[PDB]
Amino acid sequence: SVVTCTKDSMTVRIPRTLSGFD
Amino acid sequence: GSSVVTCTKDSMTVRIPRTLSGFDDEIP
Amino acid sequence: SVVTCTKDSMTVRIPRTLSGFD
Amino acid sequence: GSSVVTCTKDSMTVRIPRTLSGFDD
Amino acid sequence: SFWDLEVKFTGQTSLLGMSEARQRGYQFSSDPYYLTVQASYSAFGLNVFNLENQRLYVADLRLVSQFGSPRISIDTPMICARDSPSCNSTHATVLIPFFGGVLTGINVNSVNIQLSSYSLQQHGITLDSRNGYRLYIKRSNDVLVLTFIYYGKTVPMLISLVCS
Amino acid sequence: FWDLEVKFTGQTSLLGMSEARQRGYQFSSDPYYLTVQASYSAFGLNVFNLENQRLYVADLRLVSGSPRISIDTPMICARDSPSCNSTHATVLIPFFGGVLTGINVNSVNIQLSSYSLQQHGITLDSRNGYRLYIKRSTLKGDRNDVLVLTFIYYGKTVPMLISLVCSG
Amino acid sequence: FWDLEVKFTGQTSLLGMSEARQRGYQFSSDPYYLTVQASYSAFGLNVFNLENQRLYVADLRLVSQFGSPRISIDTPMICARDSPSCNSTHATVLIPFFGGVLTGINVNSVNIQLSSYSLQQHGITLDSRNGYRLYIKRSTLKGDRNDVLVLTFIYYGKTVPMLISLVCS
Amino acid sequence: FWDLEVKFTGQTSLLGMSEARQRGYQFSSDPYYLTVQASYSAFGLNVFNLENQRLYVADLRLVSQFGSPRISIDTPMICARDSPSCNSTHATVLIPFFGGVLTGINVNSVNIQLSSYSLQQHGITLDSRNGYRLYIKRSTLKGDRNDVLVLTFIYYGKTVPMLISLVCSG
Ligand SMILES: *[C@@H]1O[C@H](CO)[C@@H](O[C@@H]2O[C@H](CO)[C@@H](O)[C@H](O)[C@H]2NC(C)=O)[C@H](O)[C@H]1NC(C)=O
Ligand SMILES: *[C@@H]1O[C@H](CO)[C@@H](O)[C@H](O)[C@H]1NC(C)=O
Ligand SMILES: *[C@@H]1O[C@H](CO)[C@@H](O)[C@H](O)[C@H]1NC(C)=O
Ligand SMILES: *[C@@H]1O[C@H](CO)[C@@H](O)[C@H](O)[C@H]1NC(C)=O
Numbered sequence: 001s002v003v004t005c006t007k008d009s010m011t012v013r014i015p016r017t018l019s020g021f022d
Numbered sequence: 023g024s025s026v027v028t029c030t031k032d033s034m035t036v037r038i039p040r041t042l043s044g045f046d047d048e049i050p
Numbered sequence: 051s052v053v054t055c056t057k058d059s060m061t062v063r064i065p066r067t068l069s070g071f072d
Numbered sequence: 073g074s075s076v077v078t079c080t081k082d083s084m085t086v087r088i089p090r091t092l093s094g095f096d097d
Numbered sequence: 098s099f100w101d102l103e104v105k106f107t108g109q110t111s112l113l114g115m116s117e118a119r120q121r122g123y124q125f126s127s128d129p130y131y132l133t134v135q136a137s138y139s140a141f142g143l144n145v146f147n148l149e150n151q152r153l154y155v156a157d158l159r160l161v162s163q164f165g166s167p168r169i170s171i172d173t174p175m176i177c178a179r180d181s182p183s184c185n186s187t188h189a190t191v192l193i194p195f196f197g198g199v200l201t202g203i204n205v206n207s208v209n210i211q212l213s214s215y216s217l218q219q220h221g222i223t224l225d226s227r228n229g230y231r232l233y234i235k236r237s238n239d240v241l242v243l244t245f246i247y248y249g250k251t252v253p254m255l256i257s258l259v260c261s
Numbered sequence: 262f263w264d265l266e267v268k269f270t271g272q273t274s275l276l277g278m279s280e281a282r283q284r285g286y287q288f289s290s291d292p293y294y295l296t297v298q299a300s301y302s303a304f305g306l307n308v309f310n311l312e313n314q315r316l317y318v319a320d321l322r323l324v325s326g327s328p329r330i331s332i333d334t335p336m337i338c339a340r341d342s343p344s345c346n347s348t349h350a351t352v353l354i355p356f357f358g359g360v361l362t363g364i365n366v367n368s369v370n371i372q373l374s375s376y377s378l379q380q381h382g383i384t385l386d387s388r389n390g391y392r393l394y395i396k397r398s399t400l401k402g403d404r405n406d407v408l409v410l411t412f413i414y415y416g417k418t419v420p421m422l423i424s425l426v427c428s429g
Numbered sequence: 430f431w432d433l434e435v436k437f438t439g440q441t442s443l444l445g446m447s448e449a450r451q452r453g454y455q456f457s458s459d460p461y462y463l464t465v466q467a468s469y470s471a472f473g474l475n476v477f478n479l480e481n482q483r484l485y486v487a488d489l490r491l492v493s494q495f496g497s498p499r500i501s502i503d504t505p506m507i508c509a510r511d512s513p514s515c516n517s518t519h520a521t522v523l524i525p526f527f528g529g530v531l532t533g534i535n536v537n538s539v540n541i542q543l544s545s546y547s548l549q550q551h552g553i554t555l556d557s558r559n560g561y562r563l564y565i566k567r568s569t570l571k572g573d574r575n576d577v578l579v580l581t582f583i584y585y586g587k588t589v590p591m592l593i594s595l596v597c598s
Numbered sequence: 599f600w601d602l603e604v605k606f607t608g609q610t611s612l613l614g615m616s617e618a619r620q621r622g623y624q625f626s627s628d629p630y631y632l633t634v635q636a637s638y639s640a641f642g643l644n645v646f647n648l649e650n651q652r653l654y655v656a657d658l659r660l661v662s663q664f665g666s667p668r669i670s671i672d673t674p675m676i677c678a679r680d681s682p683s684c685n686s687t688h689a690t691v692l693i694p695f696f697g698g699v700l701t702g703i704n705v706n707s708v709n710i711q712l713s714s715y716s717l718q719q720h721g722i723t724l725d726s727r728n729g730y731r732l733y734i735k736r737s738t739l740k741g742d743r744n745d746v747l748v749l750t751f752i753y754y755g756k757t758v759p760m761l762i763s764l765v766c767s768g
Contacts, residue, residue: 005508013462020127029177044458055338063294070627079677094290165588358586416528472608
């Protein structure tokens with residue numbers, strides 16, 4: 001959920017399970 | 023019940039799998 | 051420039067002359 | 073109306089008309 | 098509200114919060130393995146077509162998250178022939194009006210007919226596709242799945258093969 | 262001449278002038294301004310609702326053509342705002358992807374300080390969208406009542422002018 | 430699988446895994462995360478600039494190739510690569526106006542209210558004349574390689590938190 | 599009011615007026631036009647070579663700083679800097695296949711139909727087999743400072759008229 005910023009790359013990790021409703 | 027529309031006399035139902043797939047590094 | 055909202059329509063007017071350089 | 077690239081051996085120049093073209097003349 | 102329901106209706110899109118969608122006739126259930134979206138036939142934004150006493154309900158739905166960085170949008174269109182099949186004698190009939198969806202697969206009882214060594218006729222199904230899709234299924238539990246390609250989305254429509 | 266791009270359901274559709282005029286958009290040229298007009302029935306509108314109050318969003322772009330200009334001309338409009346009772350006129354803005362940065366009431370910028378808002382007779386609730394509770398006395402009670410809500414929406418400044426005449 | 434759709438210079442383009450991997454993107458699967466990584470030389474990056482600090486913005490989306498559950502995942506990237514610039518007492522983060530509205534500030538897992546008094550108490554001053562100009566007090570930090578800044582923007586309808594180390598380089 | 603977007607090698611660089619002026623571009627304000635000039639040493643030019651003739655291509659787009667209306671103006675620059683190369687009675691323009699498709703030909707303010715007969719009526723022989731090569735009859739030119747050639751290109755969907763004086767480049 002956050003963009004990781006280093007001097008060489010931009011990295012984002014996205015959960016593989018979708019959130020429920022209730 | 024897997025991305026298929028299940029039609030009934032009163033309602034329509036779809037089931038969306040919660041687990042997302044990969045890209046070329048699990049099953050290329 | 052600005053969105054005008056009425057009972058029936060949404061209207062926007064844009065100037066025809068392009069702005070300059072600072 | 074139009075915007076052309078003017079090319080000399082030393083520079084590249086484009087002039088853009090400031091007034092936008094209308095919807096129906 | 099984790100997710101918003103996007104309904105395409107009359108050439109426009111309405112974004113509905115979870116509570117508003119429930120108010121307007123949709124239901125939402127969550128399993129460990131599936132997200133469940135249900136729409137009652139009275140739900141908002143449903144498109145209804147008629148061919149011969151058989152109605153096709155089309156919902157152009159998309160769940161759109163209210164989340165932050167991962168704004169996930171999932172197309173969950175629903176297509177249902179509510180009244181199919183009509184049975185008289187020696188024929189159960191399923192009627193699908195032309196609605197912009199492309200019939201790409203017919204599946205009867207876990208048997209994909211496009212991937213089968215037998216033909217549609219050998220499965221006892223007769224298809225007329227001049228004025229919509231008409232399936233004539235000989236009468237002599239069972240379920241039928243009709244797969245559609247609709248606006249780039251593959252929509253399997255499962256119905257039971259009981260006589261209404 | 263121009264074409265009308267409409268972002269609708271995740272895809273962008275380009276319409277010609279005639280097709281857009283058929284599908285609910287209008288175009289007009291005077292010496293000073295180009296004018297775009299849309300009904301609330303036009304093609305491609307994304308509508309948001311907050312307790313029966315609809316917020317119409319048109320993501321439109323005019324595209325020309327050696328000078329290939331593209332102009333973003335989005336429209337945001339709270340068609341049913343403000344619903345009124347005896348004491349307050351209430352503007353309900355649903356969350357729709359635009360960031361509220363500017364509030365103006367009858368040509369008076371307020372700078373979005375909750376303290377100065379409360380002092381100006383406005384209550385702003387951000388829990389379920391933007392809920393503006395305006396004092397009907399603070400309004401002139403004429404056709405000259407105005408509300409401008411300025412949003413940052415997809416890298417654009419979109420001032421929404423609505424009349425603070427009670428909903429009908 | 431997933432394909433990468435890239436919004437670039439106003440146009441939308443779909444990129445396969447092979448093209449993206451050749452052109453500076455990486456795709457990896459974790460038992461818990463799908464990980465997308467972009468090199469600053471990657472295709473379709475837009476490079477804003479405020480003073481000598483660069484902000485790289487990629488408007489990216491993961492589109493499933495399996496159309497039955499057609500899934501679209503916006504994965505926008507906003508990074509101030511050269512931030513911060515430091516001086517004797519202040520570390521300065523310079524964000525140009527790039528389409529993102531600064532909505533939250535986080536320093537070492539502490540969310541700071543955008544009140545002028547709260548920011549000043551936390552040693553932060555914010556200038557909004559030409560981009561967002563953050564001047565961060567070095568004293569309030571907790572050493573070197575131990576401080577993280579998350580600037581949350583609202584970027585074209587997506588809430589994008591940008592995590593950067595507040596190291597002086 | 600405006601910024602200059604330089605689109606090079608898969609990325610875009612958003613340059614203020616000052617920084618663009620430092621990296622090789624220029625901007626002037628005129629009541630009638632908005633003018634952008636670039637030197638052949640500007641930052642972000644794509645340079646292509648066909649025989650002895652060089653083709654510079656800048657993928658430039660003016661993006662407004664002001665946000666109330668947001669305007670982006672495609673102003674791509676394409677220039678055959680060393681064109682034309684006369685020998686005695688023939689003026690030759692050579693364009694490498696750089697991804698821009700030849701769409702129009704205008705000589706001395708006269709649009710020409712893209713056909714063999716029409717071209718040679720106006721003194722032009724066009725070969726598109728190995729890049730775009732035009733062999734124009736100097737006898738059909740005025741032989742002045744005002745001989746001009748305009749070639750319209752479709753460049754990734756953009757219309758790009760390229761005005762080069764038809765005076766030998768030496
Ligand atoms: C480091 O830089 C910061 C920001 O430029 C300086 O802090 C400001 O300095 C000015 C004077 O130049 C004061 O008027 C401000 O009150 C200071 N605080 C701000 C702007 O938040 C700081 O002095 C610099 N330190 C040096 C050069 O040693
Ligand atoms: C039942 O309907 C089928 C469908 O055309 C028809 O062929 C058949 O003759 C009908 N039989 C009776 C008894 O109605
Ligand atoms: C009118 O609406 C405002 C909005 O919050 C409320 O505070 C007030 O009590 C209402 N007055 C009535 C219902 O008489
Ligand atoms: C001059 O150039 C033309 C083509 O550019 C060529 O056909 C002609 O033969 C040349 N003149 C000579 C070789 O004397």
